[PDB]
Design an enzyme around this catalytic site. Structure first.
Site, PDB file in Angstrom:
ATOM      1  N   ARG A 260       0.793  -1.226   0.000  1.00 29.09           N
ATOM      2  CA  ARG A 260       0.000   0.000   0.000  1.00 29.09           C
ATOM      3  C   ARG A 260       0.826   1.277   0.000  1.00 29.09           C
ATOM      4  O   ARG A 260       0.236   2.364  -0.036  1.00 29.09           O
ATOM      5  CB  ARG A 260      -0.947   0.042   1.193  1.00 29.09           C
ATOM      6  CG  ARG A 260      -2.073  -0.941   1.109  1.00 29.09           C
ATOM      7  CD  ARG A 260      -2.932  -0.807   2.331  1.00 29.09           C
ATOM      8  NE  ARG A 260      -2.352  -1.510   3.474  1.00 29.09           N
ATOM      9  CZ  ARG A 260      -2.744  -1.342   4.728  1.00 29.09           C
ATOM     10  NH1 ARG A 260      -3.631  -0.413   5.054  1.00 29.09           N
ATOM     11  NH2 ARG A 260      -2.234  -2.134   5.683  1.00 29.09           N
TER      12      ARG A 260
ATOM     13  N   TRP B 283       1.547  -5.388  -8.925  1.00 28.84           N
ATOM     14  CA  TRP B 283       2.614  -6.290  -9.331  1.00 28.84           C
ATOM     15  C   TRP B 283       2.825  -7.300  -8.219  1.00 28.84           C
ATOM     16  O   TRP B 283       2.335  -7.121  -7.105  1.00 28.84           O
ATOM     17  CB  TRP B 283       3.922  -5.560  -9.643  1.00 28.84           C
ATOM     18  CG  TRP B 283       4.319  -4.531  -8.653  1.00 28.84           C
ATOM     19  CD1 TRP B 283       4.988  -4.730  -7.474  1.00 28.84           C
ATOM     20  CD2 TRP B 283       4.092  -3.124  -8.759  1.00 28.84           C
ATOM     21  NE1 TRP B 283       5.187  -3.523  -6.838  1.00 28.84           N
ATOM     22  CE2 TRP B 283       4.643  -2.523  -7.610  1.00 28.84           C
ATOM     23  CE3 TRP B 283       3.485  -2.309  -9.724  1.00 28.84           C
ATOM     24  CZ2 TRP B 283       4.592  -1.145  -7.390  1.00 28.84           C
ATOM     25  CZ3 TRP B 283       3.437  -0.940  -9.505  1.00 28.84           C
ATOM     26  CH2 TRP B 283       3.986  -0.374  -8.342  1.00 28.84           C
TER      27      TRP B 283
HETATM   28  C1  HEM Z   1       1.143  -2.361  -6.367  1.00 27.59           C
HETATM   29  C2  HEM Z   1       1.668  -3.530  -5.985  1.00 27.59           C
HETATM   30  C3  HEM Z   1       0.957  -4.450  -4.968  1.00 27.59           C
HETATM   31  C4  HEM Z   1       1.586  -5.377  -4.236  1.00 27.59           C
HETATM   32  C5  HEM Z   1       3.104  -5.671  -4.247  1.00 27.59           C
HETATM   33  C6  HEM Z   1       0.590  -6.034  -3.414  1.00 27.59           C
HETATM   34  C7  HEM Z   1       0.829  -7.044  -2.496  1.00 27.59           C
HETATM   35  C8  HEM Z   1      -0.160  -7.800  -1.918  1.00 27.59           C
HETATM   36  C9  HEM Z   1      -0.032  -9.120  -1.337  1.00 27.59           C
HETATM   37  C10 HEM Z   1       1.261  -9.956  -1.242  1.00 27.59           C
HETATM   38  C11 HEM Z   1      -1.238  -9.479  -0.877  1.00 27.59           C
HETATM   39  C12 HEM Z   1      -1.591 -10.812  -0.217  1.00 27.59           C
HETATM   40  C13 HEM Z   1      -2.157 -11.611  -1.389  1.00 27.59           C
HETATM   41  C14 HEM Z   1      -2.341 -13.046  -0.996  1.00 27.59           C
HETATM   42  O1  HEM Z   1      -1.632 -13.514  -0.067  1.00 27.59           O
HETATM   43  O2  HEM Z   1      -3.202 -13.721  -1.612  1.00 27.59           O
HETATM   44  C15 HEM Z   1      -2.192  -8.422  -1.166  1.00 27.59           C
HETATM   45  C16 HEM Z   1      -3.536  -8.408  -0.858  1.00 27.59           C
HETATM   46  C17 HEM Z   1      -4.451  -7.420  -1.189  1.00 27.59           C
HETATM   47  N1  HEM Z   1      -4.178  -6.357  -2.026  1.00 27.59           N
HETATM   48 FE1  HEM Z   1      -2.361  -5.643  -2.491  1.00 27.59          FE
HETATM   49  N2  HEM Z   1      -0.648  -5.477  -3.690  1.00 27.59           N
HETATM   50  C18 HEM Z   1      -0.465  -4.495  -4.657  1.00 27.59           C
HETATM   51  C19 HEM Z   1      -1.448  -3.715  -5.231  1.00 27.59           C
HETATM   52  C20 HEM Z   1      -2.766  -3.621  -4.886  1.00 27.59           C
HETATM   53  C21 HEM Z   1      -3.798  -2.794  -5.510  1.00 27.59           C
HETATM   54  C22 HEM Z   1      -3.520  -1.888  -6.727  1.00 27.59           C
HETATM   55  C23 HEM Z   1      -4.952  -3.017  -4.848  1.00 27.59           C
HETATM   56  C24 HEM Z   1      -6.355  -2.426  -4.991  1.00 27.59           C
HETATM   57  C25 HEM Z   1      -6.578  -1.258  -5.606  1.00 27.59           C
HETATM   58  C26 HEM Z   1      -4.660  -3.965  -3.781  1.00 27.59           C
HETATM   59  C27 HEM Z   1      -5.527  -4.453  -2.846  1.00 27.59           C
HETATM   60  C28 HEM Z   1      -5.340  -5.592  -2.108  1.00 27.59           C
HETATM   61  C29 HEM Z   1      -6.352  -6.206  -1.299  1.00 27.59           C
HETATM   62  C30 HEM Z   1      -7.776  -5.643  -1.116  1.00 27.59           C
HETATM   63  C31 HEM Z   1      -5.823  -7.305  -0.727  1.00 27.59           C
HETATM   64  C32 HEM Z   1      -6.568  -8.267   0.247  1.00 27.59           C
HETATM   65  C33 HEM Z   1      -7.190  -9.430  -0.527  1.00 27.59           C
HETATM   66  C34 HEM Z   1      -7.899 -10.405   0.388  1.00 27.59           C
HETATM   67  O3  HEM Z   1      -8.283  -9.990   1.516  1.00 27.59           O
HETATM   68  O4  HEM Z   1      -8.101 -11.581  -0.027  1.00 27.59           O
HETATM   69  N3  HEM Z   1      -3.344  -4.291  -3.863  1.00 27.59           N
HETATM   70  N4  HEM Z   1      -1.480  -7.421  -1.787  1.00 27.59           N
HETATM   71  C1  LIG Z   2      -9.932 -12.794  -3.045  1.00 30.62           C
HETATM   72  N1  LIG Z   2      -8.708 -12.344  -2.363  1.00 30.62           N
HETATM   73  C2  LIG Z   2      -7.555 -12.538  -3.268  1.00 30.62           C
HETATM   74  C3  LIG Z   2      -6.219 -12.278  -2.571  1.00 30.62           C
HETATM   75  C4  LIG Z   2      -5.168 -12.213  -3.661  1.00 30.62           C
HETATM   76  C5  LIG Z   2      -4.907 -13.348  -4.423  1.00 30.62           C
HETATM   77  C6  LIG Z   2      -3.947 -13.304  -5.425  1.00 30.62           C
HETATM   78  F1  LIG Z   2      -3.659 -14.384  -6.178  1.00 30.62           F
HETATM   79  C7  LIG Z   2      -3.269 -12.126  -5.672  1.00 30.62           C
HETATM   80  F2  LIG Z   2      -2.347 -12.094  -6.645  1.00 30.62           F
HETATM   81  C8  LIG Z   2      -3.527 -10.994  -4.927  1.00 30.62           C
HETATM   82  C9  LIG Z   2      -2.751  -9.777  -5.249  1.00 30.62           C
HETATM   83  C10 LIG Z   2      -3.426  -8.664  -5.713  1.00 30.62           C
HETATM   84  C11 LIG Z   2      -2.731  -7.514  -6.054  1.00 30.62           C
HETATM   85  C12 LIG Z   2      -3.499  -6.315  -6.580  1.00 30.62           C
HETATM   86  C13 LIG Z   2      -1.354  -7.489  -5.920  1.00 30.62           C
HETATM   87  C14 LIG Z   2      -0.700  -8.633  -5.433  1.00 30.62           C
HETATM   88  N2  LIG Z   2       0.638  -8.625  -5.285  1.00 30.62           N
HETATM   89  N3  LIG Z   2      -1.403  -9.746  -5.127  1.00 30.62           N
HETATM   90  C15 LIG Z   2      -4.480 -11.026  -3.915  1.00 30.62           C
END
Ligand code: HEM
Ligand SMILES: CNCCc1cc(F)c(F)c(-c2cc(C)cc(N)n2)c1
Ligand SMILES: C[C@H](O)[C@H](O)[C@H]1CNc2nc(N)[nH]c(=O)c2N1
Ligand SMILES: [Zn+2]
Length: 409
Positions: A111, A280
């Site tokens: 974030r 990414w």
């Molecule tokens: C820009 C690079 C980003 C990186 C490196 C990143 C990284 C991550 C990672 C490692 C997770 C955990 C995913 C998993 O374990 O399945 C995650 C979850 C999440 N990301 Fe980020 N993310 C990025 C961008 C974004 C963007 C652009 C959004 C929304 C506008 C976002 C929203 C979320 C949300 C809502 C979750 C929670 C999903 C859940 O509760 O299942 N992310 N992110």
């Molecule tokens: C329904 N909850 C899905 C959680 C989830 C699963 C997954 F396989 C992803 F790849 C990302 C995810 C999303 C973004 C925007 C960046 C990032 N690095 N990972 C998040």
């Protein structure tokens, strides 16, 4: 006004932002649900409080809290919730809402980038073909020749509930899963129900490993329709290791663009059931979870073999050892191809720095330790030692039922 400590740096931050929290966590005074994976039609009575609350913070954000434009937009939205029992966001409010939904995502370690988000307004969309077109432009923009860029495409908001726009895919780009005639699994086992759904809707499956699934797009609550993302838009990274030349023989590859398409974007009480968002990858998502989960590709078996490891004894840590090599390889392969990726060390460091900024100029940063800490090497990253307060701010990304359970066909 609670304090959160970092036990590696002795740094303390005071959280007051949690006072603005509205929703509930699942935890009570006598039970903590912090490791529960999923913690759990709207009327016009409920709608204006949510609109007002959101419009207040939006106008406080452009340094015009209480100005005339704020008051008029308040009355404008109040009156539109009268005539229509709903309202429509301004473009600016939509971009604000979406960025803060990301900002407020306590489970996201990436974030620090939340203000650099490209919002694609697809609220004029009417058909699944239109969704497909909007998603293709999202993919192409967000991929950007491997110089990945964060993006979200927002489809029409829920109205009655039976006219939802939904991307049935959990992510825009996922590999197929096929159970085998011998009971095993090909490709990604996580997608085996979804892959069969595509087949039920007519997908002709190339029953292989890394087969990009088609989009299943539902527009205006209508039955969903299949579309293949032009493969030139699906950027893939062949996974090689920098030391082990046999690693290419594994024949592993992954897609560059992580794009979640099954979540719900909540802004001012409006619900956006289709809001695919991408960023990414952090290396561990692929190397640890996608590749080495027992219910996913589960490659620790093979990789350990080719490393000449002791797989007889659990305590030889052959699993840990092969897990590191796999993640060195995922990172090296993405980087050598100039495809954006972040290692779990740099990502967690940035999140601590991000947290410091949020506590300074916002009073806090909701964070879910269970999700922020990477799935390997937890305590040699700084987030392991960082106490985090989890709480639910809005705008927010919310979970929502898989559409094949709620849809009326
Ligand atoms: C820009 C690079 C980003 C990186 C490196 C990143 C990284 C991550 C990672 C490692 C997770 C955990 C995913 C998993 O374990 O399945 C995650 C979850 C999440 N990301 Fe980020 N993310 C990025 C961008 C974004 C963007 C652009 C959004 C929304 C506008 C976002 C929203 C979320 C949300 C809502 C979750 C929670 C999903 C859940 O509760 O299942 N992310 N992110
Ligand atoms: C329904 N909850 C899905 C959680 C989830 C699963 C997954 F396989 C992803 F790849 C990302 C995810 C999303 C973004 C925007 C960046 C990032 N690095 N990972 C998040
Ligand atoms: C039981 C537990 O809540 C579940 O396995 C969680 C743990 N933490 C996680 N953390 C991230 N980043 N991603 C996940 O899928 C999970 N899964
Ligand atoms: Zn708790």
């Amino acid at each position: 006004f609670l304090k959160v400590k970092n036990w590696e740096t002795d740094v303390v931050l005071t959280d007051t932002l949690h006072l603005k929290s509205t929703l509930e966590t699942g935890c009570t005074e006598h039970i903590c649900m912090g490791s529960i994976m999923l913690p759990s039609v709207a009327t016009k009575d409920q709608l204006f409080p949510l609109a007002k609350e959101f419009l207040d913070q939006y106008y406080s954000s452009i340094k015009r809290f209480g100005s005339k434009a704020h008051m008029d937009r308040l009355e404008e939205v109040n009156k539109e919730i009268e005539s229509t029992s709903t309202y429509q966001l301004k473009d600016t409010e939509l971009i604000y809402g979406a960025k803060h939904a990301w900002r407020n995502a306590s489970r996201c370690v990436g974030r620090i980038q939340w203000s650099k988000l490209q919002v694609f307004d697809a609220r004029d969309c009417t058909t699944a073909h239109g969704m497909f077109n909007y998603i293709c432009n999202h993919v192409k923009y967000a991929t950007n020749k491997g110089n990945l860029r964060s993006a979200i495409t927002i489809f029409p908001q829920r109205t009655d509930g039976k006219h939802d726009f939904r991307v049935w895919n959990s992510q825009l780009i996922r590999y197929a899963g096929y159970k085998q005639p011998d009971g095993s699994t090909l490709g990604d086992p996580a997608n085996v129900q979804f892959t069969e759904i595509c087949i039920q809707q007519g997908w002709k499956a190339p029953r292989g490993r890394f087969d990009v699934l088609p989009l299943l797009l539902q527009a205006n609550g209508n039955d969903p329709e299949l579309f293949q993302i032009p493969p030139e838009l699906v950027l893939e990274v062949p996974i090689r290791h920098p030391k082990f030349d046999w690693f290419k023989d594994l024949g592993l590859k992954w897609y560059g663009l992580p794009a979640v398409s099954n979540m719900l974007l909540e802004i001012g009480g409006l619900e956006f059931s289709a809001c695919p968002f991408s960023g990414w990858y952090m290396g561990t998502e692929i190397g640890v979870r996608d590749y080495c989960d027992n219910s996913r590709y589960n490659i620790l078996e093979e990789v350990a073999k080719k490393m000449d490891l002791d797989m007889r004894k659990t305590s030889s840590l052959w699993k840990d050892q092969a897990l590191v090599e796999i993640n060195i390889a995922v990172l090296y392969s993405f980087q050598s191809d100039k495809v954006t990726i972040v290692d779990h060390h740099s990502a967690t460091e940035s999140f601590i720095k991000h947290m410091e900024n949020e506590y300074r100029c916002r009073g806090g940063c909701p964070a879910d330790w269970v999700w922020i800490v990477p799935p390997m090497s937890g305590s040699i990253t700084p987030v392991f030692h960082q106490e985090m307060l989890n709480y639910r701010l809005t705008p927010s990304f919310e979970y929502q039922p898989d559409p094949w359970n709620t849809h009326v066909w």
